[PDB]
Design a protein around this ligand. Structure first.
Ligand SMILES: */C(=C\S(=O)(=O)c1ccccc1)[C@H](CCc1ccccc1)NC(=O)[C@H](CCCNC(=N)N)NC(=O)N1CCN(C)CC1
Length: 215
């Protein structure tokens, strides 16, 4: 695989978002993945709707949490692959209350045909990401509360509790690392991103890795 990949440098990753006071991290992870996959299929980079998932995906629990794999399956099986634009279905749950699901009035921004669940293997995930783009991952982020920068090497790795987006890696660095897009504003971490060490299953990053499929 390439020594290092950074999909942000390639124009494939939208701005860092803010879930607000809502446990919708799973929807931010799934949507960020779709955004990147849609771009990488040759379409313009477009913000898509986390609210669609939070309000309408009843196999998940809105501001009380969810699974990115459930979100991808909902999009395909219950929403015929359609993912609405952010502009037409804007985020409204930042104070913890998700408005009721609505269908009419929204504009489809992207379409997916399925999703893949990747091996629980950091090298295989990296190699897949280099060719196929950013990957949704579940992590234990309990120990991320005071992170302000650097490569994390003792992430508490005990219980999957958060969903984020792998956007790159660097195997050439002194301490190889993953580059992760979080959804806690750009004031958190490294302009909204975190680097965790790569090779040691930091934060259980290998355990629940997946991606939408476009086309
Ligand atoms: C989002 C995580 S967070 O950004 O809120 C956060 C904050 C501080 C530290 C760490 C993370 C979301 C929070 C859901 C929540 C739960 C209780 C009270 C209030 C909000 N976490 C998740 O949605 C989580 C994502 C991991 C998916 N993978 C997995 N669980 N194997 N999933 C769930 O929380 N979740 C899914 C499973 N279901 C049985 C329980 C709820």
């Amino acid at each position: 695989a390439p020594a290092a990949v950074d999909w942000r440098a390639r124009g494939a990753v939208t701005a860092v978002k803010d879930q607000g006071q809502c446990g919708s991290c799973w929807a931010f992870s799934a949507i960020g993945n779709v955004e990147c996959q849609w771009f990488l299929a040759g379409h313009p980079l477009t913000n898509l709707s986390e609210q669609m998932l939070v309000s309408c995906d009843k196999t998940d629990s809105g501001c009380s949490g969810g699974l990115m794999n459930n979100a991808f399956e909902w999009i395909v099986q219950e929403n015929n692959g359609a993912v609405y634009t952010e502009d037409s279905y804007p985020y409204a749950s930042g104070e913890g209350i998700s408005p009721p699901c609505t269908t009419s009035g929204h504009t489809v921004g992207a379409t997916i045909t399925g999703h893949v669940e990747l091996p629980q293997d950091e090298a295989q995930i990296a190699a897949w990401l280099a060719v196929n783009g950013p990957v949704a991952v579940a992590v234990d982020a309990s120990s991320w509360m005071t992170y302000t920068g650097g490569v994390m090497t003792s992430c508490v790795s005990e219980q999957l509790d958060h969903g984020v987006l792998l956007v790159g890696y660097n195997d050439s660095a002194a301490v190889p690392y993953w580059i992760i897009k979080n959804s806690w504003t750009t004031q958190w971490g490294e302009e909204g991103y975190i680097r965790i060490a790569k090779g040691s299953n930091q934060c259980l990053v290998k355990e629940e890795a997946s991606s939408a499929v476009v086309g």
